[PDB]
């Protein structure tokens with residue numbers, strides 16, 4: 225194949241042609257069967273410690289919109305949960321659908337949400353850089369958050385209005401002072417399991433922490449996401465929607481629940 229994406233010919237069903245781990249045994253996302261999750265009271269409490277999160281840029285890369293963070297210090301970290309130590313926040317990005325019915329990567333008891341946020345952290349204690357950690361075992365901790373449609377979300381206009389600046393693939397804009405505290409739900413309950421990156425290279429490097437409680441945005445904010453393009457300034461315009469990987473087989477992994 226010549227590239228990867230979400231189209232008919234370059235989409236998730238074909239990724240295995242370039243990325244054979246696509247058919248491996250620790251692949252994400254999965255369908256979370258709520259009643260087959262194993263309670264785990266032994267888990268430490270999940271601490272998204274984001275007080276000094278210092279944002280740097282927002283970028284459309286042809287697959288998602290993505291915001292990066294400085295990660296020179298252990299300032300912005302996730303700790304506790306199933307994590308044997310702290311992980312430095314690198315970036316967040318979203319996945320979403322054509323319609324309300326689809327868009328999220330993980331499903332709960334067969335049910336999709338219209339979007340899913342992924343906060344990507346790395347193990348800077350063990351590994352020297354993020355690209356290294358990104359393909360190593362226990363290199364990453366990804367926290368996912370579903371999004372339903374409902375009433376408005378104020379903190380999430382600063383993000384959503386910036387989407388106009390970065391609408392073509394390849395465009396990057398300064399994005400200072402966005403703290404992602406404002407994208408987290410009240411509850412810190414979660415499911416966790418070992419899995420992979422959901423886009424190439426699909427490395428089996430991820431401890432997934434999926435939050436139980438979603439955040440709400442308005443159909444209106446949701447629509448601004450759909451006004452992004454997969455494609456660059458000098459090509460035919462194809463809007464970014466259905467940029468998600470379906471659930472993958474569990475092949476015997478344990479999904480722990482913290483509640």
Ligand SMILES: CCOc1ccc2nc(S(N)(=O)=O)sc2c1
Nearest residue numbers: 342344355358421422423424425
């Ligand atoms: C250095 C390679 O960086 C990568 C590549 C793919 C990738 N996919 C995810 S996701 N959708 O959070 O599971 S984070 C990530 C980081």
Ligand SMILES: [Zn+2]
Nearest residue numbers: 317319342422
């Ligand atoms: Zn993702």
